[PDB]
Every structure is written in structure tokens, then in C-alpha cells.
Design a protein around this ligand. Structure first.
Ligand SMILES: CC(C)(C[C@]1(c2ccc(-c3cnn(C4CC4)n3)cc2)NC(=N)N([C@H](COC(=O)NC2(C(F)F)CC2)c2ccc(Cl)c(-c3ncnn3C(F)F)c2)C1=O)C(F)(F)F
Lengths: 99, 99
């Protein structure tokens, strides 16, 4: 499919038993989700964007259902104002920019 | 052309007659550039949400060329991690996400 950019490109994902709305974000290196429970070990990280930085927990090897795919990747969990699918997952579903 | 997402989608832009590197950012509503001089008057805008908010200068109807595609639109100037081409200009150049 083709997703135009007249509006924020939002999709529904399934992760950790939960459904979430998230933004397809080519400006994000990694996926960042609002606070939620995830399995496995994690390590703290600081991530920067407009306005400064927030502290998040980094989980690796997380399965996310998105755009008809089952993709594996890193998920950062913390006080993000929006759920974000970053490039680390976008590549796995074959998403590209085209013009 | 098609741009994959294994690396940051950095491209060359031209603004004010000068070449700069900028990030094609589907997660950005707006285009925000590192400090530079632009013509005319500006108006205030507040953007952000990652650890805080930043004041930026908003300039309207600015000529900016992105990968050879000429656009004219709103450019914000302020303290951004890197020059960002947001959806306001990605739409002008016909950019979409595809999978
Ligand atoms: C992954 C990050 C970087 C977060 C981030 C994001 C996206 C959407 C919202 C969002 C949407 N709705 N809401 C509100 C309703 C609740 N919040 C909030 C944050 N995603 C993204 N692409 N951008 C860029 C900056 O990206 C970068 O710096 N990239 C990097 C590169 F430069 F190196 C990696 C640094 C950007 C530029 C210019 C603008 Cl105007 C906007 C923008 N559009 C809308 N709001 N904003 C706001 F941010 F100003 C975003 C982000 O800041 C991270 F890491 F912080 F989480």
C-alpha cells in the first residue's frame, strides 16, 4: 500500500497482548512506546528530539504485529507524547520513502 | 526515487542558495532548520514535547529545494538536533511511505 503524508501516518500495532496506535516515523531511529509492560531484560537510555531528552527502558527482540507483518526489534518504553514506530522496525516490514 | 530506511534518510537540500543536509521526517508535522538567516518577518511558534518545548521562528513562503524538487512553504528555525524536512514539505514534493 501507499501511505500519503497529508495527515500523520498512524497505524494500529499489536505488542505484548495490547493494541496501540502509533506513528510511522522515519525521523526516529527506534520505536518508542508509552509506558507498558514488556518481557525480558532492559537497559536505560536517553533519547533526544525537539525540546531535549527523555529517559526510556530499552527492550530488545520484541515482536510487534504491524501492517500485516510480524516484525522483531528494539522497543524503548517511556514518557513519550506519542507512540512511535522507528526505522528499526520500518525496515523489517519493507517500508520505504518514495517520490 | 526510493529511499530505504536502514540508515537515517538524510538528503541534500538547498535554501538561501546554500546546500545543507536534512532528514526526511514523516514523524514531523513541520520543517525545522538549524540556525540560519532567512528573509522577511517571522512569527512565533512553539514545538516540542521531548523533555520540553522550544520556541522557533516561523518564516512563510520560503523557497527550499529538496533532492532537486523545488518547494515553497513554511520553514521553522530553531534549536533542532538536525535539519528536519517535515510533512508540510514532504507533501509538496510528492513523498509517500510505501510497503
Ligand atoms: C523519535 C523522537 C525524535 C521524537 C519525534 C516526535 C514525533 C512526533 C511527536 C508528536 C506528534 N504529536 N505529538 C503531540 C500530540 C501529542 N507529539 C513528538 C516527537 N519524532 C520525530 N520524527 N521528531 C522530529 C525530530 O526528530 C529528531 O530530532 N530526530 C533525531 C535525528 F535528528 F537525529 C533522532 C534525533 C520532529 C521534528 C519537528 C517536529 Cl515539528 C516534530 C513534531 N511533530 C509533531 N510534534 N512534534 C514535536 F516533536 F515538535 C517532530 C521528534 O521529535 C524521539 F527520539 F524524541 F522520541
Amino acid at each position: 500500500p501507499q501511505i500519503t503524508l497529508w495527515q500523520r501516518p498512524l497505524v494500529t500495532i499489536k505488542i505484548g497482548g495490547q493494541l496501540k496506535e502509533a506513528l510511522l516515523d522515519t525521523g526516529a531511529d527506534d520505536t518508542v512506546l508509552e509506558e507498558m509492560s514488556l518481557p525480558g531484560r532492559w537497559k536505560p537510555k536517553m533519547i533526544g528530539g525537539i525540546g531535549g531528552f527523555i529517559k526510556v527502558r530499552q527492550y530488545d527482540q520484541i515482536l510487534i504485529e504491524i501492517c500485516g507483518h510480524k516484525a522483531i526489534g528494539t522497543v524503548l518504553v517511556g514518557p513519550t507524547p506519542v507512540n512511535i514506530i522507528g526505522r528499526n522496525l520500518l525496515t523489517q516490514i519493507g517500508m520505504t520513502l518514495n517520490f
